[PDB]
Symmetry: C3
Subunit: 205 residues, 3 copies
């Protein structure tokens, strides 16, 4: 089976199985392992790997999409002695996650979000982009091949294609998404399409 429990290890005493909304579509060639929650109308495409086997949940909010070859994984959040590693946990609305993906988020082909990380609602994470140890705000755009490592990206900003942002001083001066910006409407279109693809693929299973 491609939907599986995580294994017992010294940093995971109890196996968890994924919690998947009945309206989500998980492609038979995707892999989803461990403590993962997947929301309504989510589409998970071929060759994606969502793997939560180091403690703490990976959460994927409603109407989000995880496209082909995307990887979601996270650093250990509980060490061998049962002690939570706080640096490796993100807090969102009073709850703790290893990776939090909000609602209406697009994780486009071959991107990767590696915990600890949070991605706010209505954000587009572009093809081959990378997010690690970062909080990306709502209504953001990571263009293809951009990356955010160790930073907070404020709401409504975009990172130009290929730019690797590693310092908060850079993240603070990112340009704003405006109506005339080339990717300002991209995520809404991708979400609309993927919500419809998820329902169409569900009707073939």
């Amino acid at each position: 089976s491609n939907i599986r429990e995580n294994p017992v290890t010294p940093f995971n005493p109890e196996p968890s199985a994924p919690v998947i909304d009945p309206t989500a579509y998980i492609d038979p060639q995707a892999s989803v392992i461990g403590e993962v929650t997947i929301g309504a109308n989510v589409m998970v495409s071929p060759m994606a790997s969502i793997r939560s086997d180091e403690g703490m949940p990976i959460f994927v909010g409603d109407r989000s999409n995880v496209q082909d070859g995307v990887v979601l994984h996270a650093l250990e959040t509980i060490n061998e002695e049962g002690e939570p590693i706080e640096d490796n946990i993100v807090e969102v609305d009073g709850k703790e996650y290893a990776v939090y993906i909000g609602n209406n988020v697009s994780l486009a082909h071959q991107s990767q979000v590696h915990g600890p990380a949070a991605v706010g609602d209505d954000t587009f994470i572009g093809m081959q982009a990378f997010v690690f140890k970062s909080k990306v705000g709502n209504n953001c755009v990571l263009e293809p091949r951009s990356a955010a490592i160790g930073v907070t990206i404020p709401d409504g900003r975009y990172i130009p294609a290929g730019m690797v942002v590693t310092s908060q001083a850079e993240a603070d001066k990112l340009p704003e998404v405006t109506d005339d910006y080339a990717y300002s409407h991209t995520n809404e279109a991708v979400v609309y399409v993927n919500v419809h693809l998820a329902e169409g693929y569900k009707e073939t299973s």
Copy 2:
């Protein structure tokens, strides 16, 4: 099955199944979905995903290769109201495609070509490279980690490793492939090898 029809959606009234030349080899761990044409002697490796579920064909010409982890996908080419979105369609020799991959093209491991896009004959698309909203000419070389977004790359040019080309002014001044250039013979060698691998893998199936 790993070779599948696309689903019915408001931008796809009729499911299509892939058309695959009998001499092509599709690895059992690759995924090929929807309106896709694959030419003669093509090799499709493990973990590649070719997904044509948003309208319009993805075409992969003869003696081309789609290596491990490569993704081919495309933006919607017909909106909900049946109206073709012309910006998202490329024209090649009088026919319309979402993605056109020519003959003798190598899409090397983990690269991605996302429609609208066309890649001309005898071109090498290097490892982890990215092509989106671009036309790449014949006899080109995209070195590993290069990218072409929103541009036309003239015939016989190469993009140095890591360079992300987003403006036509840059694409126009790319260097030329000459006989002494390190990758000038790479594609011919890769095509020769992959045509032979496809036949060898076919003899094990």
Copy 3:
């Protein structure tokens, strides 16, 4: 089966099957083909592809990990006329390999090491990083999105995130891993975790 022999071709007269230590865990959604040796306690994650079908061995040493979506492959090491192509072979301790991955090495999600290449013991190859025609020394760190092409990286150096190193003059001036460097202890932690995950996954198979 996801563990398979390579095919017969003019540059491979005899099929080889992988040699895998009984303590290694190969995920059912990984692919391992051909002349590959995998050492003790190695973890191979979903969607990884290790493909040795062009001649010469790919070796993965003990306690190493090959994470989700990683690709290992190599250029031809024997031409059609039986003649070894010496440029495409690396020598390690008196033996020849197409790709050599040492002991305690982490190949993190979506990275790629393409032969000819060697990676020394206790080295971390970061997420989405790329190594090709290079020798990476022991105790090195390739940060996420870095790349080494055509160079030798001395022992104990790191390549900052996003940096693409293509000339020996650059590789010679890379900074040194010191105790205060942010990734100085990353590999030891990742190895420890992955050795334990491999044993936990083995207990579920």
